[PDB]
Design a protein around this ligand. Structure first.
Ligand SMILES: [Mg+2]
Ligand SMILES: [Mg+2]
Ligand SMILES: [Mg+2]
Ligand SMILES: [Mg+2]
Ligand SMILES: [Mg+2]
Ligand SMILES: [Mg+2]
Ligand SMILES: [Mg+2]
Ligand SMILES: [Mg+2]
Ligand SMILES: [Mg+2]
Ligand SMILES: [Mg+2]
Ligand SMILES: [Mg+2]
Ligand SMILES: [Mg+2]
Ligand SMILES: [Mg+2]
Ligand SMILES: [Mg+2]
Ligand SMILES: [Mg+2]
Ligand SMILES: [Mg+2]
Ligand SMILES: [Mg+2]
Ligand SMILES: [Mg+2]
Ligand SMILES: [Mg+2]
Ligand SMILES: [Mg+2]
Ligand SMILES: [Mg+2]
Ligand SMILES: [Mg+2]
Ligand SMILES: [Mg+2]
Ligand SMILES: [Mg+2]
Ligand SMILES: [Mg+2]
Ligand SMILES: [Mg+2]
Ligand SMILES: [Mg+2]
Ligand SMILES: [Mg+2]
Ligand SMILES: [Mg+2]
Ligand SMILES: [Mg+2]
Ligand SMILES: [Mg+2]
Ligand SMILES: [Mg+2]
Ligand SMILES: [Mg+2]
Ligand SMILES: [Mg+2]
Ligand SMILES: [Mg+2]
Ligand SMILES: [Mg+2]
Ligand SMILES: [Mg+2]
Ligand SMILES: [Mg+2]
Ligand SMILES: [Mg+2]
Ligand SMILES: [Mg+2]
Ligand SMILES: [Mg+2]
Ligand SMILES: [Mg+2]
Ligand SMILES: [Mg+2]
Ligand SMILES: [Mg+2]
Ligand SMILES: [Mg+2]
Ligand SMILES: [Mg+2]
Ligand SMILES: [Mg+2]
Ligand SMILES: [Mg+2]
Ligand SMILES: [Mg+2]
Ligand SMILES: [Mg+2]
Ligand SMILES: [Mg+2]
Ligand SMILES: [Mg+2]
Ligand SMILES: [Mg+2]
Ligand SMILES: [Mg+2]
Ligand SMILES: [Mg+2]
Ligand SMILES: [Mg+2]
Ligand SMILES: [Mg+2]
Ligand SMILES: [Mg+2]
Ligand SMILES: [Mg+2]
Ligand SMILES: [Mg+2]
Ligand SMILES: [Mg+2]
Ligand SMILES: [Mg+2]
Ligand SMILES: [Mg+2]
Ligand SMILES: [Mg+2]
Ligand SMILES: [Mg+2]
Ligand SMILES: [Mg+2]
Ligand SMILES: [Mg+2]
Ligand SMILES: [Mg+2]
Ligand SMILES: [Mg+2]
Ligand SMILES: [Mg+2]
Ligand SMILES: [Mg+2]
Ligand SMILES: [Mg+2]
Ligand SMILES: [Mg+2]
Ligand SMILES: [Mg+2]
Ligand SMILES: [Mg+2]
Ligand SMILES: [Mg+2]
Ligand SMILES: [Mg+2]
Ligand SMILES: [Mg+2]
Ligand SMILES: [Mg+2]
Ligand SMILES: [Mg+2]
Ligand SMILES: [Mg+2]
Ligand SMILES: [Mg+2]
Ligand SMILES: [Mg+2]
Ligand SMILES: [Zn+2]
Lengths: 83, 99, 124, 99, 138, 208
RNA sequence: UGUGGACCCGCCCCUUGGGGUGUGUCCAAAGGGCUUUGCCCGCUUCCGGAUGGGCCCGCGUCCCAUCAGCUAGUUGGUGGGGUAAUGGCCCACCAAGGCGACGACGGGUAGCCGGUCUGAGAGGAUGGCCGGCCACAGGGGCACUGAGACACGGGCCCCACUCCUACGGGAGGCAGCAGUUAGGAAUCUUCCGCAAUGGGCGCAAGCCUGACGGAGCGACGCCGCUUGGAGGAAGAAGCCCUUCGGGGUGUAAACUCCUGAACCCGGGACGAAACCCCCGACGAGGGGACUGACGGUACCGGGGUAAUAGCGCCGGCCAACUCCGUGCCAGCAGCCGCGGUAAUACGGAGGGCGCGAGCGUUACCCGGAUUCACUGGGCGUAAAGGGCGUGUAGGCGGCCUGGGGCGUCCCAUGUGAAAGA
RNA sequence: UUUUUU
């Protein structure tokens, strides 16, 4: 099943994640389908999260499954906000 | 697109099969001169239509057997044995340069 | 040669033969001594040069040079071969590291102590 | 030592016999049907070709022939029956095949 | 038979200019004629004109040279200092529009044969077309 | 760690006054005063004509030793200058002049180069309100180079800023003397520096 | 039960086995859970998406011609078997074909790429780490189970080895993480942790995870940083040279003053917000609560001591010179060369130059090397015109017009993953 | 006969 998850691209003690569409079977840092945003947990920059919701909205239509942490971040950019 | 080639039939002797010789022009990757390579393809001729010396268009197809992945599309130019005689003579030269 | 010639045959890269058959192309190779000798050099010079026949971990028996004013190397002592040739001695293609297993460093060596393998003394 | 992935191996031999059994039935019935088609009994060959088909599509319901593999044998059977049934044809039952 | 008429014409000019001939003839050809046109436009030759010799057509190339110079070797400076055939038979040279060289940092020309005609290196670049690199002239 | 030892001995070997000593390179004790010849037993012997490499080598040292930097950081700064757009020559100088430890001296906060280094290294220098204790820190145009109010009562600081009264600063710098502030206005130009170093000589040293 | 799908045959449209239609035949399933009248976790058939993959094709892919001929399922055909699926993939029968100098066959070597190093470039070299594909799991063969394997920690068999053995017979398989041994010039801890990310199973809670995140060791590489700063004699001692006047180490030290690496004391993280609970319909949304290896580490505030320097070189290339010692000796040496009584080349000292927590060395790669020359070389005498001819293949092609538009040139577009640069 | 051509 195709999933939406994070991929660690930061350094030692400085993590930077790439919210990413990939098959669950590939490595967590391995090849992926599409880069759909980034996440800075340490919040070091003014913009530490970006999504491109309408792209993330596409993959949820074709059956991508987000992680608990991915869904948490997607909700923060309002992927599910329906008003 | 299915790959398509244009060459000359050099072999009639098989059944339902003709050997098509497709030349190719391209400059040398370093020395830059125009060189002419060529490669024989095993084509499928279901109706035994095409003969020796015919110039035909060949097209990438679902494999018919080993070594046979192309079918004959149409006859471009019919009956020019000079292209065949060029191939035979070179093949005939290999009886020398042995011992 | 013509362009056509180059297409037909093309240049021939010049293969470079190794000057040090210390196999596995190793930076160093250890071996046990066979003989400890003293040999006469080529024409312009004259001296007694201390060398050693060495049976190598590469499966080789070669001559090595003993640097320094004097050595403790004996017939059966084990050593590490360095590489590099003694010019005025024909056939000696490899040196010997001083400061390695059974070859001590040169005593009273005060100038070039990285080579010849000697430690740092004390000044009272 | 002693991983309980051996539980899988124990089940593997269960399913081994199951798949093996159904297949030996498919084959034995198919050869029995095609025997009669070659032997000209139109009704009996048909009454058997039905059960062969039913047994085939039942084997595909599980993990034995799941793919179009079931269709191949179904296809091959109905052809060879109808073909062999062309020797004083008279397709008596006419159940399995189409008009 | 003559092998490369262009190099032959490029040389016929190269040889004539070294002994400071007033004129020289080259066997007439339309492609050659377009080459000579670029040279007469770019000021390397006085010009040219068709002529027959023993009934066969030729092209008189009127060379130009510099001022008679000072002490020893008063021979003038050449207008054509260098000419070299680039894309010869047996090794053809074709360059795209971005591959066209800058000849002598702009002071020279590169005669390009293009689908849009025989152009100098500059004409070919403002036209945005490449092709067969005929020769250097500077 | 950078070079640490006799300094006004290197005033002599370069043949040019090197103000790394701070004061006393101004007073007639620099040993550039009444001893311009190089150090050593043979310093007073007639020097042989320097090779074309000899000149290029000495010119680099004359520049490198002036800022008090190891060759490691020095070379890397050059290779950075060659890639950036502009004249490799001047850009390299502006990069040296952007060193915090060098700006501290240039701002007159410290008497010498080595002294300005220690002031940074011990955290006495402020850059835009934060402490910066790295002498290699590159100052960008517009940054405020101040003194930590923790150190504003230190007698060494009130000493140098006392002689800075009425003293002028480089055209690419400006300083508030009372509040012990400072600002890096712009990258200095070749003309902004009076350094007795031919930069083309140093570039020519690295083409090899 | 027949939504529908499968199969033979016909028809229609497409055009290789794509879609539709008709008759006939064949094919479906499973329950569990509660807040038990309704909802959640599931089940069956079919169509589509998404993702992952199989097979096929053009092209590119190291050396040896002292490998020149190779080939019997080998080349093709018909029919069949097998597969998810084409195919000599296998089988029967028929035809006698298929491949090669444009490098067949054989031999040697080697995972390949993104990239990396080098270089002005073309190019040469390389493929560690990371990312993509492939191949293998002691050697060889084989299938089973499954959507998927011919399966590293699954099975059967042969072989070599190790262990148990009641001699009949069994048990194994670190190229998983550490760790041992051997070989070797040489390569780490039998560490912490489920807190983060990711994966497996489950309604969930949760369980598993040597993937992973962290720590440890090693100057192995990169980078940042300290061994003080300022004042200080026309200039101590000692050592070194000396024209015996003096010169050198050198503001260097002593010593005056300031700062305060270490270290002590206190505070003390970001990385962590969801899963969950509650409201709202188990949705949007809102609200609330638990959750650390690193680690009391990072960092901040206070206190505060002058507190590691080394290595190479100094005859030329190449930057840095004198004295003494030794006398073709002892030795230096990358190359040219030094030493056989004044050696700036040996060995030490003083001094100097170069780098500096590194400095040298050896090996290896590219460079200089235009010394395999595409860019960019040559063959009268320096290395190099074949003894001469004929002529096959191939390479090359005078002038004019016209068609084509393969090479060639231009525009648009798709592709050129990420990292790197 | 050997090194050194000063
Ligand atoms: Mg995968
Ligand atoms: Mg939505
Ligand atoms: Mg609304
Ligand atoms: Mg609404
Ligand atoms: Mg035929
Ligand atoms: Mg066939
Ligand atoms: Mg067709
Ligand atoms: Mg033959
Ligand atoms: Mg050869
Ligand atoms: Mg012996
Ligand atoms: Mg020493
Ligand atoms: Mg189980
Ligand atoms: Mg049976
Ligand atoms: Mg199966
Ligand atoms: Mg550069
Ligand atoms: Mg630019
Ligand atoms: Mg620049
Ligand atoms: Mg520049
Ligand atoms: Mg300015
Ligand atoms: Mg350079
Ligand atoms: Mg129906
Ligand atoms: Mg029906
Ligand atoms: Mg039941
Ligand atoms: Mg069931
Ligand atoms: Mg699809
Ligand atoms: Mg090939
Ligand atoms: Mg057969
Ligand atoms: Mg077949
Ligand atoms: Mg037949
Ligand atoms: Mg070929
Ligand atoms: Mg191999
Ligand atoms: Mg580069
Ligand atoms: Mg290569
Ligand atoms: Mg390669
Ligand atoms: Mg790898
Ligand atoms: Mg195997
Ligand atoms: Mg093994
Ligand atoms: Mg095996
Ligand atoms: Mg399964
Ligand atoms: Mg496998
Ligand atoms: Mg294992
Ligand atoms: Mg074990
Ligand atoms: Mg060992
Ligand atoms: Mg480790
Ligand atoms: Mg689930
Ligand atoms: Mg466990
Ligand atoms: Mg790790
Ligand atoms: Mg004195
Ligand atoms: Mg001082
Ligand atoms: Mg204090
Ligand atoms: Mg946290
Ligand atoms: Mg928080
Ligand atoms: Mg939890
Ligand atoms: Mg409720
Ligand atoms: Mg919510
Ligand atoms: Mg804690
Ligand atoms: Mg503090
Ligand atoms: Mg001290
Ligand atoms: Mg050097
Ligand atoms: Mg010198
Ligand atoms: Mg030496
Ligand atoms: Mg003596
Ligand atoms: Mg002498
Ligand atoms: Mg002497
Ligand atoms: Mg000496
Ligand atoms: Mg010496
Ligand atoms: Mg010294
Ligand atoms: Mg460092
Ligand atoms: Mg080289
Ligand atoms: Mg080269
Ligand atoms: Mg070059
Ligand atoms: Mg060579
Ligand atoms: Mg050439
Ligand atoms: Mg060229
Ligand atoms: Mg040459
Ligand atoms: Mg000769
Ligand atoms: Mg001759
Ligand atoms: Mg000859
Ligand atoms: Mg022509
Ligand atoms: Mg032609
Ligand atoms: Mg075209
Ligand atoms: Mg990229
Ligand atoms: Mg990027
Ligand atoms: Zn000074």
């Amino acid at each position: 099943m195709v999933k939406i998850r994070l991929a660690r691209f930061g350094s030692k003690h400085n993590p930077h994640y790439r919210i990413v569409v990939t098959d669950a079977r590939r490595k967590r840092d391995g090849k992926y389908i599409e880069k759909i945003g980034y996440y800075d947990p340490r919040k070091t920059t003014p913009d530490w999260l970006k999504v491109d919701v309408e792209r993330a909205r596409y993959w949820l239509s074709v059956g991508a499954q987000p992680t608990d942490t991915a869904r948490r971040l997607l909700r923060q950019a309002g992927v599910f906000r329906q008003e | 697109p299915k790959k398509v080639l244009t060459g000359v039939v050099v072999s009639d002797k098989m059944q339902k099969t003709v050997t098509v010789l497709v030349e190719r022009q391209f400059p040398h990757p370093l020395y830059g001169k125009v060189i002419k390579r060529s490669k024989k393809y095993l084509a499928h001729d279901p109706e035994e239509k095409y003969k020796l010396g015919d110039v035909v268009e060949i097209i990438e197809s679902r494999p018919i057997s080993k070594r046979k992945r192309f079918r004959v599309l149409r006859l471009v130019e019919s009956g020019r044995m000079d292209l065949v005689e060029k191939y035979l003579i070179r093949r005939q030269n290999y009886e020398s340069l042995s011992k | 040669p013509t362009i056509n010639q180059l297409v037909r045959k093309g240049r021939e890269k010049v293969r470079k033969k190794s000057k040090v058959p210390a196999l596995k192309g190793a930076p160093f190779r250890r071996g046990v001594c066979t003989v400890v000798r003293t040999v006469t050099p080529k024409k312009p010079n004259s001296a007694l040069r201390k060398v050693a026949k060495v049976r190598l971990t590469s499966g080789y028996e070669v001559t090595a040079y003993i640097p320094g004013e004097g050595h403790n190397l004996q017939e059966h002592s084990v050593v590490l071969i360095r590489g590099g040739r003694v010019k005025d001695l024909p056939g000696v293609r490899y040196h010997i590291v001083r400061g390695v297993y059974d070859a001590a460093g040169v005593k009273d060596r005060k100038k070039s102590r990285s080579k010849y393998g000697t430690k740092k003394p004390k000044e009272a | 030592r002693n991983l309980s992935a051996l539980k899988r191996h124990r089940q593997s031999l269960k399913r081994r016999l199951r798949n093996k059994a159904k297949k030996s039935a498919i084959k034995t019935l198919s050869k029995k049907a095609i025997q009669l088609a070659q032997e000209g009994k139109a009704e009996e060959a048909l009454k058997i070709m039905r059960k062969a088909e039913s047994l085939i599509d039942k084997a595909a319901k599980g993990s034995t022939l799941h793919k179009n593999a079931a269709a191949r044998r179904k296809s091959r059977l109905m052809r060879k029956v109808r073909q062999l049934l062309e020797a004083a044809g008279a397709p008596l039952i006419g159940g399995g095949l189409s008009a | 038979m003559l092998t490369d008429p262009i190099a032959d014409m490029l040389t016929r000019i190269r040889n004539a200019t070294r002994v400071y001939k007033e004129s020289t003839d080259v066997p007439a050809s339309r492609f050659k004629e377009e080459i000579l046109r670029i040279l007469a436009r770019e000021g390397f030759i006085k010009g040219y004109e068709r002529v027959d010799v023993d009934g066969k057509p030729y092209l008189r190339v009127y060379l130009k040279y510099g001022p008679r110079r000072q002490g020893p070797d008063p021979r003038p400076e050449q207008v054509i200092h260098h000419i070299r055939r680039i894309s010869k038979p047996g090794r053809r040279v074709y360059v795209g529009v971005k591959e066209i060289p800058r000849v002598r940092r702009g002071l020279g020309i590169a005669i390009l044969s293009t689908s849009k005609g025989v152009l100098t290196d500059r004409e070919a670049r403002k036209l945005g077309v490449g092709g067969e690199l005929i020769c250097e002239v500077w | 760690g950078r070079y640490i030892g006799p300094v006004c001995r290197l005033c002599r070997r370069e043949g040019v006054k090197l103000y790394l000593k701070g004061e006393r390179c101004y007073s007639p004790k620099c040993a550039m005063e009444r001893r311009p010849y190089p150090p050593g037993q043979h310093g007073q012997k007639r020097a042989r004509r320097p090779s074309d490499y000899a000149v290029r080598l000495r010119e680099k040292q004359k520049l490198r030793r002036i800022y008090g930097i190891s060759e490691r950081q020095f070379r890397n700064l050059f290779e950075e200058a060659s890639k950036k757009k502009g004249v490799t020559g001047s850009v390299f100088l502006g990069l040296l002049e952007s060193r915090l430890d060098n700006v501290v001296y240039r701002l007159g906060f410290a008497v010498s180069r080595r002294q300005a280094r220690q002031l940074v290294r011990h955290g006495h220098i402020t850059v835009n309100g934060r402490r910066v204790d790295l002498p290699s820190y590159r100052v960008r145009p517009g940054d405020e180079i101040a003194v930590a109010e923790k150190s504003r009562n230190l007698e060494l600081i009130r000493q140098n800023l006392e002689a800075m009264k009425g003293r002028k600063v480089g055209p690419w710098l400006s300083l508030d003397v009372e509040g012990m502030k400072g600002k890096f206005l712009r990258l200095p130009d070749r003309e902004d520096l009076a350094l007795p170093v031919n930069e083309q000589l140093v570039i020519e040293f690295y083409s090899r």
